[PDB]
Amino acid sequence: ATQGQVITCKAAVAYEPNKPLVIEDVQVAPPQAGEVRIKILYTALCHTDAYTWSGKDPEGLFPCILGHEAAGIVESVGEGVTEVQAGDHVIPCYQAECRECKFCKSGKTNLCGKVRSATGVGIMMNDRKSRFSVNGKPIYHFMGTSTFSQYTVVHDVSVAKIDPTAPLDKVCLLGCGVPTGLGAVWNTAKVEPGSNVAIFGLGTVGLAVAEGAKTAGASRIIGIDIDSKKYETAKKFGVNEFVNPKDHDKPIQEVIVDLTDGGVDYSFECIGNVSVMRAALECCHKGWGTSVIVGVAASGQEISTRPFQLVTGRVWKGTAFGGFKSRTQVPWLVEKYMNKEIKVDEYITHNLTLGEINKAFDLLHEGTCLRCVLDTSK
Amino acid sequence: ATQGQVITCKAAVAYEPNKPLVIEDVQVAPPQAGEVRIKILYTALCHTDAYTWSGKDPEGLFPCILGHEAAGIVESVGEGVTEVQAGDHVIPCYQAECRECKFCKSGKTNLCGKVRSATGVGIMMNDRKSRFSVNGKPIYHFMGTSTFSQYTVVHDVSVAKIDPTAPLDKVCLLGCGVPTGLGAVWNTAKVEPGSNVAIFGLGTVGLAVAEGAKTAGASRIIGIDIDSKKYETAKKFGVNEFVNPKDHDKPIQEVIVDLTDGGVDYSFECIGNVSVMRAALECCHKGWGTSVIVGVAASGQEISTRPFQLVTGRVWKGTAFGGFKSRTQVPWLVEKYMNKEIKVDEYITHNLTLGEINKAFDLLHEGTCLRCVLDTSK
Ligand SMILES: [Zn+2]
Ligand SMILES: [Zn+2]
Ligand SMILES: [Zn+2]
Ligand SMILES: [Zn+2]
């Protein structure tokens, strides 16, 4: 019986950047109007969590509870919440879908600005305060989700209600990395059957691009990485050719153009390296090739090219959460998963507990790690 | 009766960069296989001609006969030429349309690769030589057209056959600037009715962007130029709001975003300045705004931005000849002109003679000059 009451539970707190996370007993306040309190059962670590932890984000607010890929069960809801109720199985999402703002109503984008003025600064809309504290001191939320915790509080416009038979230690991946890569292909690029595709970076997101391209009927799916072992792992996701830039004196974009007689029809940058973003554009075919930025670059870094690349017909764009509408389409992706129409399981290479989260951070520097999933019960 | 003979005629020869054009008596060889010799009656000056006369082209292909906006009458054709014959009224195009190469057959671009390996280095495909000389000394072609002459030789895949009743001192403008601007809107951007658009640079190309946008049903048509005298002319072409960047302490992109509550639906850069190209991208609306590079930057200049601009929904692209297929659609543009559906006359602010071409070059520095048309008869 926890409705209307503070909950005390375990969470990993980041007190300062580039230092080990601390497991604490934190207090989680009840949900206010338009809010959902969620019992988080499984959560995965994403490089975006490490971006802010590693001090690379000048907007980083500390102390905070990181985490944004997760799945769990609603414990209670606040005033006026009707789309979910206690007991529902849910995926909290960094990308909200309010269906009422200028962006939601435009029909032109999947962005939503309803709760950005709070979630971007680690607080809640209804009272401009945080629902987390430890030893009497408030803690910042992160990305509107804060899932490295046994319980979190999120805005209702960011909660997807999913099939209650779907295994929660698998579908936690569908809150970020996998939909970002799939939708880069299906929504942003709109890749046609028979297309030639290049994928720069063969981590989780690049492998989901490969799956999206394979599902859509692409012909050549060329992976580019400096770690050739990543190619062996990538084969089951659809990568069917590989180039290591270190094997060639010519710049990688020229090697790709030579290999495809002119360049690829689509390219995808999945690392967040601006120098690789330039190479990805320049390897696109003259007259029509399109390059999609998928990885998130570090603050202040700029992409560059000579404008004749665009004047002679290449197109530069990018994707946020693969162009998907979270509350409407994340449940559809869970349906497809349950039908064996999209891969999820194969991305999960490690399973740890929340108490071992610092070991999970260490696995981010392991090439064989794609996604580590953490059980929050221990 | 000049068919098969060498013609001696007047032409403006550029012997060295940044030195005055020289009015010469030149020899024009007869056309070979797949070539067409054209009596040029009127030709207009374009910034691109002066861009090359000034060393911003790194190729240094001098002496040369510049010029690529012209209209005239076929004098003779070479072996194999069937689409035009002597007497036909024609516009030569710097953008070929062979209908047979990988680019033409793709259906995805208006670029054509058939003759560029020759026209790009100032010669003809058939024998890799020039058709121009002055007293034994060969002269490079320019852009496949070389229209600062009373006669020129071009490739048959570069000749548009037009309505014989159209006035040649007017439709010479349909060889470059006006279709570039119109097609940036209709073909590359595909601007929808109700759109808000921003146009950077209010010379000929940008005014044609305004006409294109007005015809397509755009709502707000915002002109941006550092010369506030250009606003009064631009109003005649559909611009209905104006910003001078020199009046603002803030970067112009942020001014535009504030003025349109988020940014424009489409922007067009019509100057060739890479810093303005960046501003045109960053003034596009988050989630969906699209920026088209229309102007040609100097060799080596790079465009730059922060990749989050693309990740959050903006699209960067560019256009060549407005996305028009030259042999097929330049005659259609002439028909639109004859039915008073597109403007052409209004862009012509000066009329001079080919003999006065150095005087006309100085007008390219005048804000009040849009297009100068030259009569080649003297
Ligand atoms: Zn919304
Ligand atoms: Zn993520
Ligand atoms: Zn062609
Ligand atoms: Zn031109």
UniProtKB/Swiss-Prot annotation, chains A, B:
Keyword flag Metal-binding: yes
Catalytic activity, as annotated: a primary alcohol + NAD(+) = an aldehyde + NADH + H(+); a secondary alcohol + NAD(+) = a ketone + NADH + H(+); S-(hydroxymethyl)glutathione + NADP(+) = S-formylglutathione + NADPH + H(+); S-(hydroxymethyl)glutathione + NAD(+) = S-formylglutathione + NADH + H(+)
N-acetylalanine modifications at: 1
Designated name of the protein: Alcohol dehydrogenase class-3
Functional summary from the UniProt entry: Alcohol dehydrogenase catalyzing the reduction of nitrosoglutathione. Can also use long-chain alcohols including cinnamyl alcohol and geraniol, and, to a lower extent, octanol. Plays a central role in formaldehyde detoxification. Not able to use ethanol (EtOH) as substrate.
CDD domains, sorted: alcohol_DH_class_III
Cofactors named for this entry: Zn(2+)
Keyword Repressor part of the UniProt annotation: no
Similarity comment: family membership: Belongs to the zinc-containing alcohol dehydrogenase family. Class-III subfamily.
Pfam families from the UniProt entry: ADH_N (PF08240), ADH_zinc_N (PF00107)
Lineage: Eukaryota, Viridiplantae, Streptophyta, Embryophyta, Tracheophyta
EC numbers for this chain: 1.1.1.1, 1.1.1.-, 1.1.1.284
The organism's place on the tree of life at top rank: Eukaryota
Chain positions recorded as an alcohol binding sites: 48, 68
CC per GO annotation: cytoplasm
Protein residues bound to Zn(2+) 2: 98, 101, 104, 112
Binding-site positions, NAD(+): 47, 201-206, 225, 230, 271, 294-296, 319-321, 371
Assembly with partners or alone: Homodimer.
Compartments, as annotated in UniProt: Cytoplasm
Residues where Zn(2+) 1 binds: 46, 68-69, 176
Listed GO MF terms: alcohol dehydrogenase (NAD+) activity; S-(hydroxymethyl)glutathione dehydrogenase (NAD+) activity; S-(hydroxymethyl)glutathione dehydrogenase (NADP+) activity; S-nitrosoglutathione reductase (NADH) activity; zinc ion binding
pH curve summary: Optimum pH is 7.9-9.
